[PDB]
């Protein structure tokens, strides 16, 4: 029932509050990991927690904050590691 979620978020997702939005919803949902700006203009998200909570975070990711214009995210689930102690942005 624990998983690691990888997600790559595409669209107008930088300069729009996206990483802060992801962290805020992750904290509310008790999820650890990070959100990270990539050089191509997309955003990388790594999240660990209960599958149900990760699924709710993925839905928030698909919507994004008000100014974001999100295009279909790539994502995949893999094994929970417990390497993270909080949720950070970079």
From Swiss-Prot:
Enzyme class: hydrolase
Family: Belongs to the acylphosphatase family.
NCBIfam families: PRK14440.1 (NF011012)
Coiled-coil blocks: none
Source organism, top-level taxon: Archaea
Alphabetized UniProt keyword annotations: Hydrolase
Pfam families on file: Acylphosphatase (PF00708)
Active-site residues from the entry: 19, 37
Catalytic activity: an acyl phosphate + H2O = a carboxylate + phosphate + H(+)
The organism of origin for this protein: Saccharolobus solfataricus (strain ATCC 35092 / DSM 1617 / JCM 11322 / P2)
Underlying gene: acyP
Protein name (database record): Acylphosphatase
InterPro entries linked to this entry: Acylphosphatase, Acylphosphatase-like_dom, Acylphosphatase-like_dom_sf, Acylphosphatase_CS
Molecular functions per Gene Ontology: acylphosphatase activity
EC number of the protein: 3.6.1.7
Thermal dependence: Optimum temperature is 81 degrees Celsius. Thermostable up to 100.8 degrees Celsius. Poorly active at 25 degrees Celsius. Enzymatic activity is increased 4-fold by temperature increase from 25 to 45 degrees Celsius and more than 9-fold at 98 degrees Celsius.
Activity across pH: Optimum pH is 4.7-5.7.
Record PROSITE patterns: ACYLPHOSPHATASE_1, ACYLPHOSPHATASE_2, ACYLPHOSPHATASE_3
Acylphosphatase-like domain residues: 4-90
């Amino acid at each position: 029932m624990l998983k690691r979620m990888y997600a790559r978020v595409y669209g107008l997702v930088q300069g729009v509050g996206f990483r802060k939005f992801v962290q805020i919803h992750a904290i509310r949902l008790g999820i650890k990991g990070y959100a990270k700006n990539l050089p191509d203009g997309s955003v990388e998200v790594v999240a660990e927690g209960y599958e149900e909570a990760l699924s709710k975070l993925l839905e928030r990711i698909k919507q994004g904050p008000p100014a974001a214009e999100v295009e279909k995210p790539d994502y995949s689930f893999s094994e929970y590691k417990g390497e993270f102690e909080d949720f950070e942005t970079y």
